[PDB]
Structure 1
Amino acid sequence: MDVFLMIRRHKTTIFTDAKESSTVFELKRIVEGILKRPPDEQRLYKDDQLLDDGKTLGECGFTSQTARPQAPATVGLAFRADDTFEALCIEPFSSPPELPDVMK
């Protein structure tokens, strides 16, 4: 079925969905339509394991039970500066405040 993802690089987060049968390269083509960088200038990561173009999203470990609309799975994205690839960097989101007394 469908997989729901967050494609993350620095302070940019793209919310997209793809088929579990679709490939890592088809996902780089979705990033190309939004960020205007071709698939050859992109590296995609599940946590810290680099992903192969011909591998399906299902084969990468992204499934309908782990990549849900309300809890999408994160995909790390790194770009190519000149001829070298930058190190994977995902800036975290802010932290919530301390839980109030009445909520505890």
Structure 2
Amino acid sequence: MDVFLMIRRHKTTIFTDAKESSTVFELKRIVEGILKRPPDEQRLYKDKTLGECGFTSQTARPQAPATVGLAFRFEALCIEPFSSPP
């Protein structure tokens, strides 16, 4: 019912929260608002409702947000993984 959302595109990473009832189109709009891009150049891509994708408040947590995934152009994903722990 509430899922914390993680934006991974190359270096950048963006944090916030949204409701499952929201649609992909609204999240597209939020991304455009925060990054100043047109919707066509935006392409949302996980690895009417955010729950129609397979997400739940049980998997996603304020402290343990379920790993999600996104990308940007129509170039494929290029995500640098975090550093290895010592």
Unpaired runs of 5+ residues, structure 1, are 47-54, 98-104
Which residue of structure 2 lines up, in the alignment, with residue 39 of structure 1? 39
Point out the structure with the larger helix share: 1
The alignment's TM-score, normalised by the length of structure 2, stands at 0.84
Task: Tell me how far 1:79 sits from its aligned partner.
Answer: 2.6
The alignment's TM-score, normalised by the length of structure 1, stands at 0.71
The 4+ residue runs of structure 1 with deviation greater than 3 A are none
Which residue of structure 2 lines up, in the alignment, with residue 74 of structure 1? 67
Point out the structure with the larger strand share: 1
Identity %: 100
Q: Size of the alignment, in residue pairs?
A: 85
Q: Residue deviations 1:58-80, cap 9 Å, x none?
A: 11112101111112234433333
Q: Residue deviations 1:16-74, cap 9 Å, x none?
A: 1110111111111111111111222111122xxxxxxxx41111112101111112234
The CA distance in 2 between the partners of 1:94 and 1:2, in whole Å, is: 29
Task: Give me the CA root mean square deviation.
Answer: 1.5
Paired residue secondary structure (2:52): helix
8 Å CA contact 2:8, 2:14 repeated in 1: yes
Unpaired runs of 5+ residues, structure 2, are none
